[PDB]
Amino acid sequence: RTSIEQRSNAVSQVLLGIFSYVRWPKEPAVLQLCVVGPTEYADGLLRGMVQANGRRVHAERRAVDNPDLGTLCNVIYLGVVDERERQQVFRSLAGHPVLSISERGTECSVGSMFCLNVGGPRITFEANLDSIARSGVRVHPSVLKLARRQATP
Amino acid sequence: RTSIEQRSNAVSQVLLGIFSYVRWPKEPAVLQLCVVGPTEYADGLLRGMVQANGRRVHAERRAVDNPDLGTLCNVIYLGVVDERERQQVFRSLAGHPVLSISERGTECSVGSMFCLNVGGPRITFEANLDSIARSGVRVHPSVLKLAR
């Protein structure tokens, strides 16, 4: 099976994929990613990233209970938080144009737009239509080409 | 610097502190640290560290179900794990001289020798005297004066 470092490297490439199907009403010069909560696979992200057009993705960790997350970032990578913490996070994001992605595949029921599944041979993901719809960003539907091909041996 | 980044530095400093009160049966030239499980505050550790005595601490992430954790490291820094994952981890550690520190720990009853509480204005930690007693590493008792 795949090692942690292998998976971490893949997670950032999947994230770059997802980002390509997403549009922010006010596109920043630098995309800001916040990592929130304990994570296993964010060490790659946290080195910062570059998109194909050369836009930099700056990444940093932030407290679960920071009330300004909606304002402080364009993207959130959500780690393994509890019911009360998760509610805090998605309350803070409501109203703002933020893309949310969870490290684990259980947060798609509770507010995350995309949920990663890092086990198995490839990284796959699922998405939630309700959360996408209320998000404030636009997500091209082809984003699922990425998930489907990822789930194909 | 975010609060998470400042606490991660503080976590680094607390671990180095704890390390100075710990001795290994056969002392390695390089101290291996494994970060296992989801963590918020290990980014400082993962950049690597050096002990006051000059010894380098090599850190890396390893998987919860890595069966060789006991032989792969001297210190394990343990993140969020469920019951099964915790039991799994400690089975791999059984019979090996491994220092164990968990990032959370509202109980510190079962598992790690030390449990951080990174909350509040300062990092505090608790000791599990049972886990310490049967660990293979020598923990100097002064370290309990640094616990809460």
Side-chain angles (χ1 to χ4, degrees), chain A:
Chain A
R1 64 134 171 106
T2 53
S3 69
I4 296 296
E5 179 56 29
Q6 167 81 8
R7 290 167 177 202
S8 305
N9 166 69
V11 160
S12 34
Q13 283 171 28
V14 168
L15 258 61
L16 285 179
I18 296 183
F19 297 168
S20 73
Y21 300 96
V22 179
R23 286 177 308 162
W24 281 263
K26 192 165 197 164
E27 293 286 359
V30 172
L31 207 60
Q32 288 284 159
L33 201 147
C34 303
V35 178
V36 170
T39 57
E40 266 187 284
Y41 300 111
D43 296 351
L45 310 187
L46 283 157
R47 289 173 179 284
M49 285 174 294
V50 65
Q51 299 190 276
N53 78 307
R55 176 161 64 181
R56 284 163 209 189
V57 193
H58 175 260
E60 65 195 355
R61 321 188 91 105
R62 287 191 175 283
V64 155
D65 56 24
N66 181 337
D68 306 330
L69 295 170
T71 269
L72 290 165
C73 80
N74 307 117
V75 182
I76 153 170
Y77 187 81
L78 186 70
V80 185
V81 303
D82 65 35
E83 185 188 23
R84 164 83 217 272
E85 287 171 335
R86 152 195 80 73
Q87 295 173 20
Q88 275 177 311
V89 176
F90 290 114
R91 274 190 268 116
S92 294
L93 306 185
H96 308 286
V98 171
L99 166 68
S100 62
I101 306 173
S102 279
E103 183 161 279
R104 292 184 183 184
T106 76
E107 308 297 289
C108 272
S109 282
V110 280
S112 181
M113 287 161 62
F114 301 91
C115 308
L116 296 192
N117 182 10
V118 186
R122 303 297 194 270
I123 292 169
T124 60
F125 65 91
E126 300 156 325
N128 182 274
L129 281 176
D130 178 353
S131 292
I132 286 169
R134 75 176 67 188
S135 80
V137 310
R138 309 129 97 184
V139 180
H140 198 284
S142 287
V143 71
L144 297 185
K145 275 177 192 170
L146 190 46
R148 164 168 57 144
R149 283 163 152 118
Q150 280 294 265
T152 305

